Amino acid sequence: AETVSFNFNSFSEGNPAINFQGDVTVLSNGNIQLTNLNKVNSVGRVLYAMPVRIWSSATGNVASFLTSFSFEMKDIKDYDPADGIIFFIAPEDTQIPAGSIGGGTLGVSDTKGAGHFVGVEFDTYSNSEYNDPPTDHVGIDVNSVDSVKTVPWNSVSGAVVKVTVIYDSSTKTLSVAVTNDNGDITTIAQVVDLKAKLPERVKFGFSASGSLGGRQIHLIRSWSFTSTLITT
Amino acid sequence: AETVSFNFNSFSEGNPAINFQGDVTVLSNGNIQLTNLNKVNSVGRVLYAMPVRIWSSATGNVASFLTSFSFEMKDIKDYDPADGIIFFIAPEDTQIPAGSIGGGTLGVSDTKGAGHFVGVEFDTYSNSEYNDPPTDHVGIDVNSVDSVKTVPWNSVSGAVVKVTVIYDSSTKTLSVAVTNDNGDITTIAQVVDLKAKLPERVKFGFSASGSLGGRQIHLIRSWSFTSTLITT
Amino acid sequence: AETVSFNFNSFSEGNPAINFQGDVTVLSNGNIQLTNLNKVNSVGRVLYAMPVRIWSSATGNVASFLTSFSFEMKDIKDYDPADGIIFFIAPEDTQIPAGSIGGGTLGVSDTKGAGHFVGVEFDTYSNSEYNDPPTDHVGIDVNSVDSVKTVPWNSVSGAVVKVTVIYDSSTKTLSVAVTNDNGDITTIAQVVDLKAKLPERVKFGFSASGSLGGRQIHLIRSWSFTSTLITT
Amino acid sequence: AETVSFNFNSFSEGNPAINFQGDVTVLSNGNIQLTNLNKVNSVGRVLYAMPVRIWSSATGNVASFLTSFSFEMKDIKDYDPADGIIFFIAPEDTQIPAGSIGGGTLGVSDTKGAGHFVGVEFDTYSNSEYNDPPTDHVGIDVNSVDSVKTVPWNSVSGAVVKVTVIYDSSTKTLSVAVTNDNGDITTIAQVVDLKAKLPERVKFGFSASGSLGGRQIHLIRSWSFTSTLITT
Numbered sequence: 001a002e003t004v005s006f007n008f009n010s011f012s013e014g015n016p017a018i019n020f021q022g023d024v025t026v027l028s029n030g031n032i033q034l035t036n037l038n039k040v041n042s043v044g045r046v047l048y049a050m051p052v053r054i055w056s057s058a059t060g061n062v063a064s065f066l067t068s069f070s071f072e073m074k075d076i077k078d079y080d081p082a083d084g085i086i087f088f089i090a091p092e093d094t095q096i097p098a099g100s101i102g103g104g105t106l107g108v109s110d111t112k113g114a115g116h117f118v119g120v121e122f123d124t125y126s127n128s129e130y131n132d133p134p135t136d137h138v139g140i141d142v143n144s145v146d147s148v149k150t151v152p153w154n155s156v157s158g159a160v161v162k163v164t165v166i167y168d169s170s171t172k173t174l175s176v177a178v179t180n181d182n183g184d185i186t187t188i189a190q191v192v193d194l195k196a197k198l199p200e201r202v203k204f205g206f207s208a209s210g211s212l213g214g215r216q217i218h219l220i221r222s223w224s225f226t227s228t229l230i231t232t
Numbered sequence: 233a234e235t236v237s238f239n240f241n242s243f244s245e246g247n248p249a250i251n252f253q254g255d256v257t258v259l260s261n262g263n264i265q266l267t268n269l270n271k272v273n274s275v276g277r278v279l280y281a282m283p284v285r286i287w288s289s290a291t292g293n294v295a296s297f298l299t300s301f302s303f304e305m306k307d308i309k310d311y312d313p314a315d316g317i318i319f320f321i322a323p324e325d326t327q328i329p330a331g332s333i334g335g336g337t338l339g340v341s342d343t344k345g346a347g348h349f350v351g352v353e354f355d356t357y358s359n360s361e362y363n364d365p366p367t368d369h370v371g372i373d374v375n376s377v378d379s380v381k382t383v384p385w386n387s388v389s390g391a392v393v394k395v396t397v398i399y400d401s402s403t404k405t406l407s408v409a410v411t412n413d414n415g416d417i418t419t420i421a422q423v424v425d426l427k428a429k430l431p432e433r434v435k436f437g438f439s440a441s442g443s444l445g446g447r448q449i450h451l452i453r454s455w456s457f458t459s460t461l462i463t464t
Numbered sequence: 465a466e467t468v469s470f471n472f473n474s475f476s477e478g479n480p481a482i483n484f485q486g487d488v489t490v491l492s493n494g495n496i497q498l499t500n501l502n503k504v505n506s507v508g509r510v511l512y513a514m515p516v517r518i519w520s521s522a523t524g525n526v527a528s529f530l531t532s533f534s535f536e537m538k539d540i541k542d543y544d545p546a547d548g549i550i551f552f553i554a555p556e557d558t559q560i561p562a563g564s565i566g567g568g569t570l571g572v573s574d575t576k577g578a579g580h581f582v583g584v585e586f587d588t589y590s591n592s593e594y595n596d597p598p599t600d601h602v603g604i605d606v607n608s609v610d611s612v613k614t615v616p617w618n619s620v621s622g623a624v625v626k627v628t629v630i631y632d633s634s635t636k637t638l639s640v641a642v643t644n645d646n647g648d649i650t651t652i653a654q655v656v657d658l659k660a661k662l663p664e665r666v667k668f669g670f671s672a673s674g675s676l677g678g679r680q681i682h683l684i685r686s687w688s689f690t691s692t693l694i695t696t
Numbered sequence: 697a698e699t700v701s702f703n704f705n706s707f708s709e710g711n712p713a714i715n716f717q718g719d720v721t722v723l724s725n726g727n728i729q730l731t732n733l734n735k736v737n738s739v740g741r742v743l744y745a746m747p748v749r750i751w752s753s754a755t756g757n758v759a760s761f762l763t764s765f766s767f768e769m770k771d772i773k774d775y776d777p778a779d780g781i782i783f784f785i786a787p788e789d790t791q792i793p794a795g796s797i798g799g800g801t802l803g804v805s806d807t808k809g810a811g812h813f814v815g816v817e818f819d820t821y822s823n824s825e826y827n828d829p830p831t832d833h834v835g836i837d838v839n840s841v842d843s844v845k846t847v848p849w850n851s852v853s854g855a856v857v858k859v860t861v862i863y864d865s866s867t868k869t870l871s872v873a874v875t876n877d878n879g880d881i882t883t884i885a886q887v888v889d890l891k892a893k894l895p896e897r898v899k900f901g902f903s904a905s906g907s908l909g910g911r912q913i914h915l916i917r918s919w920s921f922t923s924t925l926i927t928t
């Protein structure tokens with residue numbers, strides 16, 4: 001049993017266990033602020049520094065995992081509160097796309113909206129170019145920000161959201177339970193075959209992005225995670 | 233939207249919010265103890281007092297939910313660690329099976345292993361009459377202790393186990409993640425139509441059982457739960 | 465080469481290898497509950513029945529021990545979570561001080577806070593009369609609850625805490641390491657000359673107390689111990 | 697609260713969480729074998745992949761850590777039962793010494809015994825060139841295999857040994873508790889300033905070596921670890 005687990009109640013610039021990319025920043029309170037409010041097309045991403053072996057080519061066994069995190073998206077004048085956050089899974093060599101425009105790409109794809117990754121996105125801006133629902137939403141993404149599936153949701157400015165994700169290898173099911181400010185849960189599940197979509201080794205993390213007129217605070221407050229790959 | 237959220241840090245058999253059936257007892261430390269270690273074919277169960285409306289005959293909507301709980305199973309001389317714990321959902325009028333032989337029925341089915349309920353079992357004994365895996369296991373049961381699906385698990389005596397369950401109405405999936413002592417995680421998911429297997433009004437709870445030579449300590453420590461049904 | 469080792473995964477007041485002093489009871493789950501929630505100034509202690517030789521009056525040698533135990537402390541309505549647990553070493557004829565007032569004395573000292581012992585305390589109520597720090601803390605005590613040194617700590621109700629203690633004769637150093645709920649560790653060390661503060665034969669154990677308004681669950685889940693006295 | 701914690705009950709050729717240097721090899725049973733029996737002056741080391749930040753340049757705070765593990769040293773026909781196993785901390789760029797001659801350098805220092813590391817050695821051969829005690833022994837080394845302090849010990853062929861170390865950052869005390877096969881314990885402590893002897897980012901692991909005439913099986917069976925640095 002090859003297992004990976006950790007728990008962050010706060011963060012601090014300096015911990016080698018974390019990989020910072022782009023305009024990421026660690027506030028004084030311990031929170032991670034993914035984007036810069038004075039930059040255009042800002043993009044910041046945080047990843048667990050250590051790669052996770054989600055599946056073996058030898059045994060063909062895929063790992064299952066449980067994870068929970070919490071974030072916040074406070075509005076600021078006078079920009080459009082966009083574009084949101086996305087928890088994602090990518091190859092360990094992953095970097096912010098070359099010449100990223102941020103915006104509706106959430107920092108994980110090119111302009112077309114494609115890229116190499118898997119993710120649960122929290123959209124606060126309806127990008128019609130990526131077939132985005134009309135209202136805020138939660139989506140399951142696979143190599144594209146044009147979600148394979150999405151569900152209506154609402155991002156309350158200054159609210160702290162609680163999220164729980166469960167991946168079951170046996171069924172390739174990716175479950176997401178989102179708990180809003182008002183104690184109401186929201187959920188979206190989807191069968192995503194990770195062994196088919198990503199390499200044996202990957203990195204998990206968070207990405208947020210903005211643009212010219214679309215900007216907002218993107219805070220990642222906590223994150224606990226555990227993954228287990230059977231080796232027998 | 234219709235929501236129901238509650239959280240139990242510790243229990244008290246003098247609390248109206250919970251129904252106590254069988255030989256359930258609440259130890260001075262707040263712990264719920266399902267089986268009586270002294271009794272034979274001891275059956276103990278707990279249910280949340282107020283029924284939860286998991287679906288509408290008017291709208292046809294099914295509710296999604298996120299509930300988590302921690303329990304503990306510990307051995308004793310000179311019996312066999314048995315039989316197990318099971319998180320179940322059933323009709324609001326549910327009661328322990330008439331003339332319950334406890335044992336491998338986890339106190340929710342009849343001798344043939346059939347009852348009206350959907351739940352997640354935590355098996356510590358391999359009953360062949362119910363086609364059980366040769367080892368300890370976690371199983372998804374739908375009206376029978378002859379699990380729809382199962383996963384090799386390991387019940388470590390004296391260890392506090394954390395369990396997280398997600399029910400996505402849309403896909404009808406029931407995902408489960410269990411954290412062991414060795415820090416490794418175990419998961420199991422399975423599509424189940426609550427709407428087709430259960431009434432619109434149900435009750436959630438826990439139940440355990442023992443036999444003649446099969447007995448062990450079954451303790452439910454904490455339990456949080458939130459479910460939301462859309463009415464629009 | 466004189467060694468004394470044992471291991472308790474659970475307890476039972478039947479087994480005589482342990483003295484039961486005070487309001488201590490043993491729950492059906494095998495947890496040694498040290499205080500009586502319904503009593504005022506309750507005090508309950510537990511000692512390993514066999515006295516341990518921690519130093520020879522022949523060689524002048526002192527023993528080294530490695531011991532680890534796990535406890536739990538949980539709040540209760542509607543009293544202040546008090547007062548704490550203390551692992552301690554004392555003369556084999558040790559008993560709860562005469563007319564103990566529980567509370568901050570932790571059941572090991574008299575009113576002023578003086579007693580004949582040595583232990584690691586897990587204090588959960590700042591007692592100014594005993595120069596207690598402002599928050600919960602772990603302290604090393606020598607014939608007094610006015611700790612020789614303490615370190616900031618936090619008690620999480622219902623949380624199962626693990627502790628590992630090492631005592632090195634050569635350096636007369638007592639090193640503690642607390643493993644909290646969240647996963648973080650808290651340590652504290654202090655040079656304590658055992659052969660100078662106690663007699664050849666002593667008894668190891670736990671204690672806990674309470675007052676009129678200070679009450680809470682003080683459990684002892686497990687306990688392993690190994691000591692070795694060089695006789696060569 | 698910056699914390700790093702993991703737990704290996706076994707290992708696997710392929711886990712990204714572990715760096716393998718030298719003759720290291722992973723056995724079919726999960727053990728790690730540090731030295732190659734058919735090689736001269738063999739050297740094999742295993743390290744925790746992620747670099748650990750033991751102290752901060754900003755807060756001047758040094759972290760504390762708890763860690764335990766078990767290993768096995770078995771004889772072979774018909775080489776000399778040498779040289780031993782060392783648990784150490786070193787700069788994140790630590791590599792097997794250049795031109796390493798193995799033997800009594802335990803693969804962590806040069807021919808004169810010097811090196812940049814901190815660790816607990818389990819010496820099974822007496823190297824007078826490093827001022828070694830005459831009998832098997834455990835020692836606290838600081839940039840040298842000429843131990844800062846040692847304690848008589850005994851390496852029993854085939855025996856599984858359990859070790860627990862505690863580093864209290866405040867007193868800067870490094871404490872070690874070893875448990876021979878016969879259940880007896882051996883302890884050794886010594887103040888060591890990590891903030892002074894090592895950089896901010898270091899790595900933990902195990903090392904072992906042999907010579908042309910001295911060889912033996914060095915196995916690392918398990919390893920758990922928790923370090924915490926105070927950010928506030």
Ligand SMILES: OC[C@H]1O[C@H](OC[C@H]2O[C@@H](O)[C@H](O)[C@@H](O)[C@@H]2O)[C@H](O)[C@@H](O)[C@H]1O
Binds near residue numbers: 544569591675676
């Ligand atoms: O809250 C529980 C607490 O109760 C006591 O606290 C000391 C208390 O004594 C009364 O004499 C004084 O009037 C008041 O000012 C003091 O605060 C108990 O001593 C303490 O250990 C704890 O149980």
Ligand SMILES: OC[C@H]1O[C@H](O)[C@H](O)[C@@H](O)[C@H]1O
Binds near residue numbers: 083125127213
């Ligand atoms: O006004 C906000 C809006 O601005 C653009 O049109 C960007 O492409 C979108 O992603 C969004 O940020």
Ligand SMILES: OC[C@H]1O[C@H](O)[C@H](O)[C@@H](O)[C@H]1O
Binds near residue numbers: 336
């Ligand atoms: O040994 C215990 C075992 O005994 C039988 O075989 C019962 O049918 C099981 O349910 C279990 O209680």
Ligand SMILES: OC[C@H]1O[C@H](O)[C@H](O)[C@@H](O)[C@H]1O
Binds near residue numbers: 779821910
């Ligand atoms: O006999 C074995 C012995 O051989 C030499 O003398 C080496 O220097 C030692 O490290 C040890 O390996």
Ligand SMILES: [Ca+2]
Binds near residue numbers: 083123124126127
């Ligand atoms: Ca968008």
Ligand SMILES: [Ca+2]
Binds near residue numbers: 336355364
């Ligand atoms: Ca069974």
Ligand SMILES: [Ca+2]
Binds near residue numbers: 588591594
């Ligand atoms: Ca106090």
Ligand SMILES: [Ca+2]
Binds near residue numbers: 779820821822823
């Ligand atoms: Ca040597």
Ligand SMILES: [Mn+2]
Binds near residue numbers: 121130133145147150
């Ligand atoms: Mn979208």
Ligand SMILES: [Mn+2]
Binds near residue numbers: 377
């Ligand atoms: Mn079963």
Ligand SMILES: [Mn+2]
Binds near residue numbers: 585609
């Ligand atoms: Mn104190």
Ligand SMILES: [Mn+2]
Binds near residue numbers: 826835842
């Ligand atoms: Mn040496």
